[PDB]
Structures are given as C-alpha cells and as structure tokens.
Design an enzyme around this catalytic site. Structure first.
Site, PDB file in Angstrom:
ATOM      1  N   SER A 107       9.250 -29.223  -0.245  1.00 27.85           N
ATOM      2  CA  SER A 107       8.179 -30.116  -0.651  1.00 27.85           C
ATOM      3  C   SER A 107       8.144 -30.131  -2.180  1.00 27.85           C
ATOM      4  CB  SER A 107       6.849 -29.651  -0.062  1.00 27.85           C
ATOM      5  OG  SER A 107       5.758 -30.044  -0.877  1.00 27.85           O
ATOM      6  N   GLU A 150      17.353 -18.143  10.757  1.00 31.70           N
ATOM      7  CA  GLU A 150      16.494 -18.568  11.869  1.00 31.70           C
ATOM      8  C   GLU A 150      17.359 -19.098  13.010  1.00 31.70           C
ATOM      9  OE1 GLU A 150      13.649 -21.428  10.348  1.00 31.70           O
ATOM     10  OE2 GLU A 150      12.419 -19.894   9.394  1.00 31.70           O
TER      11      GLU A 150
END
Ligand SMILES: [Ca+2]
Ligand SMILES: [Ca+2]
Lengths: 462, 462, 462, 462
Positions: free
Chosen positions: D314, D327
C-alpha cells in the site's frame, strides 16, 4: 500485446486479456498446482464487487458514471463470461490478495472497455481505488468464499437428499429379503436386507442434517471489516447496504457478523463445515465397503447383491464384475479425510487478526464439497438405483445356518436347542430338517417361527 | 511430613516421598492425563544423571564426596527402584523441565539418604546445582529420550523379527494349499495361501529394515548444548566424557552431534521414527483385515483359515469364533495413525531455538513403539502360530470357479475357452465337467493342466 | 487363591478379586497399553446393569431373590466402590465383550458375597444368565458408553462455559487498552486488546454450542437390540422399562432409537462428538499461540502481556517466564487432533451389523473429553484469571507505528498522508512529530483523531 | 464424428480424438475432479507400452509389422505430443483400468493412423489384444507409476539440493551476525543468525537423504505379474526383456521384484515415499514460521531479517511487507500432510491380491512431489537468495538483553552476576555499562568476553 508497469518492471500483457500486471506477478510467485479457482468462487467474487460498487455509489463515495460500468462488468463475471481470465493458483501466499486483485483487474478492464476506453488505463478506472473501494482483501475474499461455500453446500444437500431417498427405495424393495446378519464377519442371526439399507438411509439422513446446520455460522460475513475488523473509516451505512445487497444477489440470508474482529480473525466456520463432510464420508465409506463385500464372488464370495456392470468385463472370463462405483466412493472419502487434515492445520495456523493460510483451506473445503457432490450423483445414477438381490442365495444362507436356532430356542428350550445346534455343527444337517426328524416341532409351527418378519422383530419368548 | 518452600509458597510433602516442591507444583499445573512417564524413560534419565555426575567429578567440577552418592542413587533409578517417585504428567508445559526436575529431586533426596543426611537438605546435595550440573533441560530431556526410544525400538525390532519368521513358517506350512485369488473382492485366478503368507512376511521384513534405519539419526545427541546449542561455558572435555559414558551405559553407539544448535532445535529424527511405525501398521492392519475376511463364516463367509479361539464360545452358537487378535491389531494400527498426526503437529510447532511441544511428541512416540511391541508378541503367541488352513474347502472353491479357465485357455484356444467359461457361469456346472462332456479335454489332461504349482507360476503354454 | 474353570483350562484367581476368568483371559489376550477404562464408564456400566436387573425382575424374567443383590452390588459400582476390579485394557478385541463381562463378573461376585455365597459360585448368580440377562455386548457396551460420554460432555460444557466467561472478564478489563493489530505478523492498524479477547470469548462461545449440540444423537440408545439390531426374542415391556430406568438413573433424557438395526451398526454419533472437540481445540490452540506471542520477551519479543509465573526462576535470568500453561494447551490440542484421526479410522472400519473397532474409538473419545476438561480447568485457574496488560509498551508501539496514518489520512488527504508515512518509516521519526514539524495538524487535533475508541470502530471521519 | 459401440451402446467420438468408448465410459462413471493425470505419468505409460511392444515382438508374441507402428505411436506419447488425449479422472474406481486403457486406446489409434488405417479399426490394432498384450491393469499401471514417481523424485532431489545449497550460502553470509536466541519465545542466550541458517541447511540435508533412500524400494517392479502376481501364462523371457527395456528407457535402475505376488498386492513403497515428503515439509513449515516471525514488523515486531518484496504494498502503508513466499511454503506443507493421510487410508484399504484404492493414492503422491518441487523453486528464486539482515537491530537486542549475563557469569562468579542481572532488570542499564560502573571488568576485557564468536562457541570459565 500491451505494456503494464510494476514496482518490479514492465510486463507484456496480451491485448485480449482482462487481467493485468498484479495477476501476472502472482503466477510468477505461485506456480504451485496449475489449477484455477472454482467457477462458483469466481461468480461469488463478481457478486461482492457488484454489491460493493452499488453500495459505494449509494453512499456517494463512488462516481456514478464509472460505477455503472463497474456493475455491468461484474454482472458478466457473475454469469460466467470471464472464467478463463482468473488464472492465479488456489495455493498462493498473500492470504488471497492475488485472487481479490484478479477480480479487481478483470472487472476494471472490462468496465473500461465497456466505456470505450483502453485497457490498463487505471487512471479512468482503478482496480484498487474504484473496484476495491471500501474493501480489504480481508473482507472481500472471505465474504466471497462464504457465499461460494454456501451455494455449493445447497447443491450437495439436494444431491445427498436424492441419494438418501433412493437408499430408502431400495430398503423398501428389499423389505422382505431375508439374509444372515454378520458380526465380526462371523455368521450371527437373521436380518432383512431392507433393514441394512434402511440403516444406510438413516445414517445418510443424519449426515444431511449435520451438513445443513453448518450453514448457519457461514451466514455471518465480515464485509466492512477493513484490514483487521475495526472498520476504520468505513461508513456504517455502506456496511448496512453492502450486506443487504450481498444477501439479495447471493440468494442467502446473510447477516453482518455482530463482532467484526472475531469474524475477521477466526476460521471455525470452515472447520465446522469440513468436520460434517468428513463425518458424512466416514459413513459413505463404510457403506461402500459393505456393498463391495456383498457383491464379492460370483463363486468364492458372499455374492449377496448384484451391482450394475460399469466396465467392460474380461471377454474371456465372465462373472467378474468389479464394484467400481463403490470403489470410487471409497477413494473420495479418503480425499475428504486428507482435505480435512489440511483444513485443520491451515486453521490452527492463524495469527493475531488474520489467518493467512485460508487459500489452501478454501481450496480444500471447496474441493471436498465438489467431489462429494459429484460422486453422490454418479454413484446414485450408475450404481444405487440398479442394485439387485440374489434372494435364493441369501435364503439358503439362512436355512443352512446355525444362528436360526436362536429363533427356535424359546419354543423348545435351552436343553433341546444346544443338542440341535451341536448336531447341525458336526453333521451340517439343516436345523429345519432336524426338528421334524426328532419331532420337537411340526412342519406347520416351524413355518411361523422361521418366518422372515417374526425372526427380525421383537416378540413373544420366555 | 516435611515442609519445603517455593516461589509459590510452602508445601507439605509426605515423609516417604523423594520428589520435591517443584514436582508437586508441576502436578498442580498439569493434572492432564493422570498418566506417568514410561519406566524406560525413567531408566534413561538415570543413565543421563549418572553419566553427568561421572563426567563432572572427573573434570573436577563436582565434589567427589557428593558425586559418588549421586551415582549410587542414579544406579537405583536405572534399576527401576523408584518408578513410583516419578509422578509428573507426560503431557506438560515447560518443554520437559518438570521431567528433568523430577529426576533431579528424586536423585538428590535419595543420595542425601544414602549418606545419612535429611531429605530436603538442598544445601548439601542440590537437584539444580549438583544433580543437574553442566546440563540443561534442552540436553538432558532429549538425550534421555533418544536413549529410551532407541532401547524401545531395539525390543520392537527383536519382536517384529520374531513375528516375521512366524509368518514365514506359515508360508511354508501353506506352500501347497491352492486357493482363489481375489481382486476387487471378485474371483480372479488361482494362488497359493503360502504366496499370500509370503507376501505378508516380505512387507514385514521391509518394515523391519525401515524401522531399523531410523535408529541412525537418533544416535546423534546434544549433550553440552546448554540453553540453545551454542555450548556457551560448556567444557569440551565434559562433553567428550559424558557422551562416552552415555554410549557405554545405554548400550547404544551414541555420538555428539556435529552442530549442536541444529541438534537442539530440530525434531526430524522423532518424526522419522513415527513415520516408519505408521507405515508398518498400515501393512499389519491390512494383513489383519485379510485374516478376518479369511476367517469369516463358518457358513456365510469365506472360511479359508481357522483362528485359535481366544474368546469363550456360546453353547447356542458354536462355530462362531470372533477373530479378536486381528481386531486388536487393527485398533493398535488406528492408534499409531493418530499418534503420528500428533507427532507431526507437535514437530511442526517448533520455534527458533527450541521445540516446546516435545513432551506430547515423546509420549506419543513411546506409546506407539510400546503398544506395537505388545500387540506383536500377543498376536504372534495367541493367533499367528496356531492358524490352520481349510484346504478341502479352498480346493472346492477352485474346482467350482471360472478363473480356472485361464490355465485351460492356451490348451483349447480363445474361442472355446470363452464359450466354456460363459456356460459354466450361467449353468452352475464346473468347468471340468463341461470339458469332459463336450470332449474338449480328457480327465487326465485336466489333472496335468490344473496342477496347483503350474497354475501359479511363470511358464509358457506347454 | 480360588479356581475358576475356562475352556482354556484351570486358572487361579485371587480370593480378594471380584473379577473372574473371562476377565483375566482378556488380560492375556490384550496386554496392550496397561491402562484401565474411565471411572465414568465404570459407573455407567453399573447404571446399565442396575437398570437391566430392575426391568428383568418387573417383567417376570429375573428371580427377585437374586435380583435384589445384583441391584445392591450395581449401586456400589455406581457409587465408585469397585473401580479397582476393572482391569481389562481399553484397547481390546472382542468389540467390548471383555469390558461388559468385566462388569458382569464383578457384579455377580459381589452380589454372591452380599447374599452369603462364595465368589465363583455362578450356579447361584451367573455373570451371563443373570447379570447379563436380556442384553448383548452389542447394546450394554455402547449404551454404557453413550451415558459415560454424555456425563463427561456435560462436565466439559460447564468447565468450558467457566473459561468463556473468564475470557469476557478480560475482554472488559482490557476494553480500553490500545495496541497494534498484526496481519501476516506485519504491523497493520490499531486494535483494542479487548477486541482480541472478545474475539476469543466468542469463538469459544461457538465451541460450547457446537459441542452441546452433539449430545442429541447420543440420547438415542439401543437397549433391546440383541446381537444385531432385530431384537430377536426381546420383550417390548423390557425395552420400555429398562429405557425409562436408564434415563432416570443417568440423569440424561435417553430415548430408545426408532430403528435398532441402525443404532447398532452405525457410529456417526461418536465421530460427530469428536469433530466438535477437534474444532474447539483448533481455536484454543490458535488462541494459545497468540498468548505465547503476546507474552514473548521481555527485551527481544512483543511483551504485550504478562502471564502468571508458574515455574521457578533463575535469579541469574530474571524477566524470563516461559508460558507453560498456553504450552500444555497447544499440546492437548495436538492430542485431540490425533485422537480424532484414530476415531475416523475406527469408525470407517465398520462391517455389516457391527463395528468391532469401538474400544479404541471409545478410549480416544473419552480421553479427548477428559483431557480438555482438565486443561481448561487448570488453564483458567493458573493463567487466564491473572493475565496483565502492558499498557505503556503497547501505546508505545502505536505511537511509532505507520498504520496510525490510516486514521490521520482522511483529515489530511492521500498525497500528504503518504508523504508523511514514507518519511516516518525511512527516518524513524513518529508520525505525530512530522504532523507538527510541518504543521499539517496540531497537538490538540492529533489527540482527538488518535482517540483509542474512534480508531477501532466504524464511523465516517468528518 | 465416428461411431464406436459398447456393451452400453453407441457413442460418437470426434474425428480428431485418439481415445475411444472405454475412455468415454470412464469419464461418465467418474466425473469427480475434472483433473487429468500428470504428464509424467502419461510419459511413463508410453514407456511401459513401448517396452512391452518391443518385448512381445522379440519373444514372437506380437506381429512385427503392427509392433513397429505401435512403438512409434508410444514414442510420440513419451515425447509428450498426445497429452490432451488423456482425459480420465485421476480419481477413479476400477484400480487404474481406465488410465491403462486410455493409454491403450490412444496408442492403438495413432498406430492405426500411422499405418494408413481408419481409427477405431480395432480388428487391425486392438487396444486390448495388441497394445495391452502380455499385461494386466495390475502391472502396467503400477509399473508406470513407479517410473513416474522416480523421475519426479529425482527432480525434487535436485531442486531441494539447490535450495539446501542456498540455505548454506546464507549461513556463511550471516556467519558473524549476532542476535538473541529464543526458547519458549523468551529471550535466552546469544546466537549467530548463521547458526540458525546452518540448522535449516542441515535439516534439509537429512530430508534429502531420507527422500533419496525412498527410491530404492521403487526400483522393484511387478511387470509380468499378470492378474494376481502368479504370472499365469507369462513368458519368463518376456518378463526379463521388458524389465531390461523399462530400465533403459526410463533411466532408472529397475529390477524385477523377487516375489511378484508380494509386489502386486503391497503398497508400502508408496507410503514410505509419502512419509519422507511429509517429514521434509514438517521441517520446511517450521523454517517458514521462523522466517515469517523474523520478518515481522516493521515497528511492532521483531524485524531481524528483510525478505524481498513480492507483492505491491500500500502506497500509504510503507514498511508493510508481507512474507508471502514463506506463507505459500506453509500452505504446501499443510497440503502434503493431508495428502499423506489420504495415502495412509488408501494403502490401509488393500484387500487380498489387489489394492483398488491406488488411483487416489498415486494422484496424491504425485501432487505432493510436484507441488514440493514447485514451491522449493519459487521460494528459492524469489525469497531465499535475497534474504538480508538487520544487523544493527539484532546487535542491540544482544547489548540490551539480560541473557548476555551468561557470558559474564564465570568471570565474576554467580553472586556478582546475579546482582548485575537484577539491576539490569530494574533500571534497564546495559549489562556492559553496569560492569564498567561497578568496575568488575575492564572495557577491554568485555571485548574478549562479549565477542560474537566467543559467546556462541564452546569456551570455558577463564
Ligand atoms: Ca434376483
Ligand atoms: Ca543490513
């Protein structure tokens, strides 16, 4: 070929593609399985983006001129017009950001094209700023997943019910078919084949019940949660409107969860679903195993039932009819067991306000529901309705058995019965053709004692 | 009665007890299963403490006056004299600390008694300062575990080898016993019961090799790791000496790990063991499944083998012999499968320099090995040796089968072979009877072709 | 010293012992774990036999002279007088036959003793003909199990509710404590510590509901099923009266199942219970992992909370408190996960009219309820009640976080907000300093925008 | 369209299709996942068919003119030209019969087309009589799978060796990087970041050895076993010739199993491979959890390492860099765990001479190896090589810790060390500073004692 730009550089995207640079980077990061997400999840993403576009227009946050085209594009996604543009791997890191962005990019590019603009012109319509407006990954992704899971559960429910209803019909059809009950795989006492099938039908009805109850917790969605569940800057009127739209377009009685933090970080609703599917497959597996034992033979097996032939037999060896439909039922059960472990491990791996392991969990949840829905269909159609009984073979199993002396026992006494049992054991002589030999019971009174119904239901004894 | 103080306060301890206030505090924290650690782990902790004392004394770190009594007390622990004093729950927080401290207290207090002093007099001989000198929780607990696991595995190998040979003896006892092979539970071609019992012998031999090879990665130990594996303030001479004593007293060729940071934080040697035990029980469960099918009957089953009765029989139903020994074998298989998942979860849960989930891990690894050993001896002694064959009934099965036609085909040809098989299956006549009446083969020709040996081994036409 | 005779020969039995030969034969057949069945199962067997005796006497089937002492002896079992006498391994073949005969022999031998007869004199009071009258292994064993599990579940529900409430207490206590939310272990946007604890309380609240709901199906019992489910020879007055007693004495609203064949061969009630237990332990493990993360430190971790010290310190290393209580919690979760797989495998293993794998199934179910009750009680007492918040350190994290900028953003605009966050991240200066430095906002405005409550709840900015 | 008839009737087949009705039959029976078998398995089926054709021709069984075209067609399958023609579901009943026949049909129809005949002219080149000559489903299928799994294992080994080598390169790069070691997530004692990375590199080395040793049992194949392993009618010369061929065309040292029955009915070689993959992913998941924890931050986490950024952040949330490569590594491990349970359950389900559950087993094994190879590649290229350290941050964890006292301890005696630690805990003063202010050690003395190498390697008390 077209030219999009990234914090990683330029990438040439085919002009006929509706995805962009982010989706491509995702495929670079995760070329794991080569699979694509379920078309029901794609449809559900469209629903989310439609609802959110509509709500954002209603609360004055989104320009009505661009929103109108955003809605038209999302609608097309809902109809399944753009399935091939969703290319990210179901097993991906990033907690579903790639999936969400694939839906934002495709809808933005189709919107732009609908308004006569070029693709990639994200200044006119931004994937992030407009299509993902007022959303996070952490609410858009799970909400679309809730919806997709619920829709697939309604399909599994109507397919299981059909199957259950057909087991019942077999139960009724075999209602007077007498056979030998087995415990420990050792001959026990007489049973009706219809009682066994009612057993199967009753367990299946309890499966329908359990699977149906798991929908209740999925009805709570976290739309408006933003990153973490706090709803920071979210308009509470947006939340109200978006939820209402989500329920209207998905067909589900969705609720906004009472506690958005809870709904954002917890994953018990999905483990709840997987648990019920597993339980259901445990029962189906067992039934399938029974069906396979019952079909064994034709000469060195139990040979109690006949299943419809579903593969061409050896054209040089008749009688060999492999029970392929139950076998496939067994292997699906095994998938579902494995799928459930993956779900379990993915779920307990959550940390603080996000479980980042959802993509492997959702992939597995959805696969479970889908393969079950599909085996239930084919098993029902290709095996179950056609099942036939070898009633002569089963009646002879009963007449030549020892365990029928249990039905006779209280009409002759513990004394007489044990002499008859021990003799029928050594000489292998029928128990019937022995009661008449000794004269302890007349031909006529044997007929009411060894009646199929009397033998398999509670009644007069001592 | 006696009174020791803790950070949590003063605790009244029985006069007889040899554990102290830290053990009691651990029983209050974790009153979980009500179980106690395996005596073989109690024994190995004894070997650990004795080896430490011996090393420390020699390195000039432990007072030789105290050390010799610590040794004496440890020797009693090794003899299984104080098993009742190890009261801590195997499922415990603290990464094994409680288990270590249970051994320290017990060995301290008993040493103190051997030299005429009071128990609880930690000023004289300390559980922490003397009995636990030079070692940490993170080296003593895992090292004791390696030694215990290895000792336990050696027993299992010995017991599994015994079982394997008994299977192999039955293979020879059944070497000429002809029967029907089944695939998909459907009749196929002839096979000898001896070939199946050799199939079982062989997979078991493969398990023994796999289990045996998991020993190697356990021979590496981390004694002298201190807290984290860096060996800070540890003496390189204490390290070499304690390791050599541990190898001498446990009987295993133990080695100091090359990288003690690696040895302190990684747990793959434990999951390597469980996996080989999981594989082993998949085969044993399947074998047991077969046996229960083969013993099914007596009248409505397969009735291929007879299992020794171990259950008392009813005087209403003789011939009903439940195969309880394969049943319990099946159930141990299911335990081990579950234990292996617990080991998996606990192993993947390691963090940085230490896996704290080691106790439930170790409890499950020790239980898997123990219950397998026990079931193996009991299944071997109360079932496997006594198994008998129903040769007559199996010969019948073969006589009345269709598979039989595969041996007959090349002496008759594809066309006539198929028409015979087809007619045999539909009319219920034996293939032999049909070969005679249609004159296609003579009674003598068929006795040479349907030779039990030739039918079940490679070899061209004639 | 006493000599009872079995088909396996003459066997010496201690004259103290109330068990007989069928029980020590199971001790020979199944020397598996060394464990004994749960006292709650023992109790429920006593309820079963008491109920049977009463119902048999009422219908005219049992002698009232003999029956009265059976009842008296059964009460003693119910009241816990005879736990010592149940010696069979919970992992056993015979499908629970030994567990049932353990109870039969013990009740007969004590009823003999109360009558003034000799232990072993089964000609007077028989463990088969009297104590086991009108019941099979295949109904008394599962019915005892249903009652036991139901009793245990009700206990676990009470404990779990106590824990839930204690979580809500901490929710309120921390309802004003500000800290950083983490998604992907990466700093995100602020969250209240109370919203995190409320999230925990709510998922636990859902676990309670899920577990409580598994009870309904266990209420259906199969007393009266005889061997297989047909109730061959059963008296309907026996069935209605025994069922009424069982329900009165157990405290549970038991019902006779509508279809005894179904209730006899299916095991889906047990997998249903285990599933809800696994789901619960998934959430509990997650929570506990969070607690261990939040407690990490005190210098190189997160240090958001302090847990009560439950193990002794090192004065050499103060500040170091291992979170042993959340650790045992994670471990009990890994156990229940394994327990669940063992249960899946045992339930899938059913054949025709009986699942003979019930003993390992039940052992694991009962174990899971018991160990969850025990850790919950202990974790609440020794950890959850006394958790403290490090308010100062958490407010510190929040003041120097970048996420704070999501709050300020709408009051300053995207361009300046992004400017300030980039500068704050690269330089290490607080966002608050940078807002004042450039005078984009004043101290007073910042103190109102950065209200703990307003940053953590939904609502339009202006 | 073309027209092929079936025992179930007429079915239209596309002109361009090389499969036939048996394949279509399969797709109607088993519309389960919509997946297609692995290209590697396709290739291996080709190798099997070509080897068999060459062997059948040499031994005089197969016509050399038909054989030549069969061999050329199979070669194109080997070359990967007909992948789209393999349409059957990996999850199927019938024990691989349709995978086998899919290959039989495709090769027959390409052989026909090459020799200028019409497709579906199975009177010229039969899928059953010619392409499948001297083979059964029960040997071709498993033989292809052994070969395919071996080839895929060899690729996984190379990939993992590369990853391993890169983990070692990073241990060397961080050989002097000092940090705080953690036990129970509690600060403990100093460790080098390189020592952690070496631990990682070392566990993977052990994984490589385990997985590699798993290849040995797969080298034994059952080619020539026929239906059941007995080799009824099989030419022994054909067997040894087809075996030499399979070894040569697949590149593996294949051996004819010494007992074909054993090899035909046992599946332990598959569960052995899967167990080794599972253990490997246990370690890999553990490593990814550490990496993720070390990446945490940037302000309220640990932030010991930086991972290359792989998603666009972001613009207003700089510093937020989610660890997406670890992950995805976790999620794959979770997948492999569940895959391994499915395998366990499939293998356990074997009955007598054939385990019909092999399809879901092989599907799972292959997916495990595949997805492992694929994450390892992507994680290595996109994460591992680029891992960098925050050495300043880590250095000050160590300066400001208590555990640094452990290095000082022996040089000042425990009494003095406890005082210094206690004040360090109260005031917050660096232990180094304290040593100066109380004059227990010179600034220059601290430099030898608190040296990174000294602190982390065996070194004694003065
Ligand atoms: Ca019929
Ligand atoms: Ca740096």
């Amino acid at each position: 070929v077209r030219i999009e730009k990234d914090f990683l550089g330029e990438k040439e995207i085919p002009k006929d593609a509706y995805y962009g640079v982010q989706t491509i980077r995702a495929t670079e990061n995760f070329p794991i399985t080569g699979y694509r997400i379920h078309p029901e999840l794609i449809k559900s993403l469209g629903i989310v983006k439609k609802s959110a576009a509509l709500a954002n227009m209603e609360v004055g946050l989104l320009d009505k001129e661009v929103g109108q085209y955003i809605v038209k594009a999302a609608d097309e996604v809902i109809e399944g017009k753009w399935n091939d543009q969703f290319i990210v791997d179901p097993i991906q890191g990033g907690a579903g950001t790639s999936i969400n962005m694939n839906a934002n990019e495709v809808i933005a590019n189709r919107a732009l094209e609908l308004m006569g603009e070029e693709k990639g012109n994200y200044s006119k319509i931004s994937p992030n700023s407009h299509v993902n407006m007022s959303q996070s990954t952490n609410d858009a992704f799970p909400t679309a997943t809730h919806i997709a899971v619920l829709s697939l559960l309604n399909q599994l429910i109507e397919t299981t019910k059909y199957m259950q209803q057909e087991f019942m019909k077999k139960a009724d059809e075999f209602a007077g078919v007498i056979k030998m009950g087995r415990t420990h795989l050792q001959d026990a006492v007489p049973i009706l084949l219809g009682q066994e099938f009612e057993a199967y039908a009753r367990v299946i009805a309890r499966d329908i019940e359990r699977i149906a109850n798991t929908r209740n917790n999925l009805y709570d969605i976290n739309m408006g949660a933003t990153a973490v569940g706090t709803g920071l800057n979210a308009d509470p009127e947006y939340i109200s409107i978006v939820t209402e739209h989500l329920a209207k377009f998905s067909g589900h009685p969705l609720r906004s969860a009472q506690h958005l933090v809870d709904a954002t970080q917890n994953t018990d609703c999905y483990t709840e679903v997987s648990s019920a599917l597993k339980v259901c497959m445990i029962n189906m597996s067992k039934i399938a195993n029974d069906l396979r034992l019952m079909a064994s033979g034709p000469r060195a097996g139990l040979s109690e039932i006949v299943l419809p032939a579903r593969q061409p037999g050896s054209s040089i060896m008749p009688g060999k009819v492999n029970p392929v439909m139950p076998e496939v039922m067994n292997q699906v059960a095994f998938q579902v067991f494995g799928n459930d472990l993956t779900i379990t491990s993915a779920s307990e791996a959550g940390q603080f306000e996000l479980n980042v392991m959802e993509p492997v969990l959702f992939f597995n949840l959805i696969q479970s529901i889908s393969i079950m829905t599909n085996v239930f269909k084919s098993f029902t159609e290709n095996c179950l309705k056609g099942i036939k009984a070898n009633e002569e073979r089963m009646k002879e199993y009963v007449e030549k058995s020892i365990g029928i002396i249990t039905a006779i026992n209280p009409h002759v006494g513990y004394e007489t019965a044990a002499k008859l049992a021990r003799e029928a054991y050594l000489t292998g002589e029928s128990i019937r053709e022995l009661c008449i030999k000794y004269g302890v019971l007349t031909e006529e009174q044997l007929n009411e004692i060894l009646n199929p119904y009397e033998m398999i239901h509670p009644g007069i004894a001592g």
